[PDB]
Amino acid sequence: KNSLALSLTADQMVSALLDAEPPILYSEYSMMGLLTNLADRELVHMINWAKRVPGFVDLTSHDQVHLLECAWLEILMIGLVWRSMEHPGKLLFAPNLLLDRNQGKCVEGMVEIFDMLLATSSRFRMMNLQGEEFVCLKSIILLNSGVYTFKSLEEKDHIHRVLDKITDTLIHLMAKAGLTLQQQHQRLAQLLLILSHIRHMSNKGMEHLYSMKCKNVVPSYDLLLEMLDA
């Protein structure tokens, strides 16, 4: 790759990811109905956001779709946890759809995943997660989630090199904030280990979508391919 993405400084990588951030959307107004409509509107923004993640458009269309297929629900979930950080005990699906755990029990099948999302929001709060760190983590999910389940060798190499640039960026942010070398490596590990919990929540979420008879609302390969080209 002749890629500009691999020439970016930590400051340029953060600036690109901050400028690509989607807005917070409102619910339009059935809990599953509201959430499905919100997710569908978020997906359109997510496609346009992914195209602005440095290195993402260097991939084939097929590899872009594979990464989005694997990451879309993890990306929605980390957004939700980020929006909810400053509302302890609550999930801010949207500014006009803020649910506490009491309302999560009233809706069958909600509460187990609700509780996992609340624990993630609490962990982000306890770590004082910064916006610059959040955008790095969301980009890692996009590039990392599908990379182990793929020209192909060159594509995987390029993804790992962009992932290395995002690591460098996270470490730069922490060094600039005044963290010791030891604190830098410890916080990097703490952030990346939360990604294992977001993967778990995404898998449980998919299983719950299936059990609610909502197989239809998962974006297909073909849907993502058409949205990328459109």
Residue 173 binding ligand 7I5, by CB under 6 A = no
Token code pair at residue 83: 């929006």
Q: Residue 171 interacts with its own copies (CB under 8 A)?
A: yes
Q: What is the dihedral of CA 91, 196, 48, 21, to 10 degrees?
A: 60
Q: How many Cα atoms sit within 13 Å of 74 on the Cβ side?
A: 24
Q: Is the dihedral of CA 100, 102, 106, 112 positive or negative?
A: positive
Residue 45: CB minimum distance to ligand 7I5, A: 10
160 binds, among ligand 7I5, its own copies, none (CB under 5 to 8 A by kind): its own copies
State the DSSP H helix or E strand holding residue 194, giving kind and residue range, or none if neither: helix 181-211
Residue pair 113/201 in contact by the 8 Å Cβ criterion? yes
Distances (CA, A) of 186 to 127, 171, 182: 11, 10, 6
What is the Cα–Cα distance from 212 to 84, expressed in whole angstroms?
25
Residue from 20, 140, 142, 173 in contact with its own copies (CB under 8 A): 140
Total of chain residues touching its own copies, rule CB under 8 A: 38
Residue 109 interacts with, from ligand 7I5, its own copies, none (CB under 5-8 Å by kind): ligand 7I5
Whole-number Å distance between alpha carbons of 84 and 91: 5
Q: How far is the CB of 117 from its own copies (least distance, A)?
A: 10
Question: Is 83 labeled as ligand-binding?
Answer: yes
Q: Considering the complex, what minimum distance in angstroms separates the CB of residue 207 from ligand 7I5? A: 8
Mark residues 187-226: x for contact with ligand 7I5 by CB under 6 A, - for none. ------------------xx-xx-------xx--------
Binding site annotation covers 42?
Answer: yes
Site string for ligand 7I5, 59-98 (x = CB under 6 A): --------------x--xx-xx------------x-----
* Residue 209 CB neighbour total at 10 angstroms: 17
Tell me the closest approach of the beta carbon of residue 199 to its own copies, in angstroms: 5
| Rounded CA separation 139/165 (Å) | 11
Which DSSP string do the residues of 104-130 spell out, in sequence order?
HHHSTT-HHHHHHHHHHHHHHHHHT--
Residue 36, binding choice from ligand 7I5, its own copies, none, Cβ under 5 to 8 Å by partner class: ligand 7I5
Could you list the residues that contact ligand 7I5 (CB under 6 A)? 30-32, 35-36, 38-39, 42, 73, 76-77, 79-80, 93, 104, 107, 109-110, 113-114, 117, 205-206, 208-209, 217-218
Instruction: List the binding residues for 17beta-estradiol.
Output: 42, 83, 208
